[PDB]
């Protein structure tokens, strides 16, 4: 047929699979290493940085912030989910930033955003949104 | 309803004294328990004594 099938052909099948498994995009991304070096989070679930600038077919301006990772010193952009949560974020403040649902790719209509703010000054953003915790220490 | 355990009957009183863990005797009404001493202080004394030379009985 179109595949080798002899009784003494294990080596050829092994090398064929070895060579051809590299054509899958996901497998390359996972086991090539370029993504690992390029990813700012360096394979971590979430990282810690410092705020430095608050910035902005659906036509809805979105609020985000620029962050500088402490452990890596590079710059990224993060988005503030809830309604009216930008006020809780002040310039030059420490934040904890995680990823979106999709690992790497952008989510939704936000252009070039792949990170999320979840904790500010050591207090959960969602908790502050519901008034469970308060920022009177800051 | 049910309670089970173990006993130990000795032929003579002396045999009990020779063959018996000390804490068992203390639990029983046989002898008197010396006041406890912290092993930490004992180790401190041992190290301090090892520090000295010749006759180290002063401390």
């Amino acid at each position: 047929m179109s595949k080798t099938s002899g009784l003494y052909t294990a080596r050829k099948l092994r090398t064929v699979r070895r060579v051809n498994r590299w054509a899958d995009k996901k497998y390359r991304k996972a086991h090539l290493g370029t993504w690992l070096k390029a990813n700012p989070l360096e394979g971590a679930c979430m990282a810690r940085g410092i705020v430095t600038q608050k910035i902005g077919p659906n036509s809805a301006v979105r609020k985000a912030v620029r962050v500088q990772l402490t452990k890596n010193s590079k710059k990224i952009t993060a988005f503030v989910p809830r309604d009216g949560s930008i006020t809780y974020i002040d310039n030059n403040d420490e934040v904890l930033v995680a990823g979106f649902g999709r690992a790497g790719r952008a989510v939704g209509d936000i252009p070039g955003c792949r990170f999320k703010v979840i904790k500010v000054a050591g207090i959960g953003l969602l908790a502050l949104f519901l008034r469970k915790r308060e920022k009177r220490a800051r | 309803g049910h309670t089970v355990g173990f006993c130990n009957a000795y032929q003579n009183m002396d045999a009990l004294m020779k063959y018996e863990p000390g804490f068992r005797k203390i639990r029983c009404g046989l002898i008197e328990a010396p006041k406890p001493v912290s092993r930490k202080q004992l180790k401190n004394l041992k190290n301090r004594r090892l520090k000295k030379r010749g006759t180290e009985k002063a401390t």
């Binding site: 309604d83 009216g84 930008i86 006020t87 | -």
Partner: protein, 48 residues
Amino acid sequence: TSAGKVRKKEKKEKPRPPRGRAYKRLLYNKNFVDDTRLGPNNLLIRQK
């Protein structure tokens, strides 16, 4: 202009629904033994 511009009825103080299995027993009779159309206006009209 101010962010959160978009951002009160007295709470209906009623006995708490039972917890544990007793809650499970409530639904069993709610859907079979008791007359029900689940969630339409007319059902809510009747209960008032």
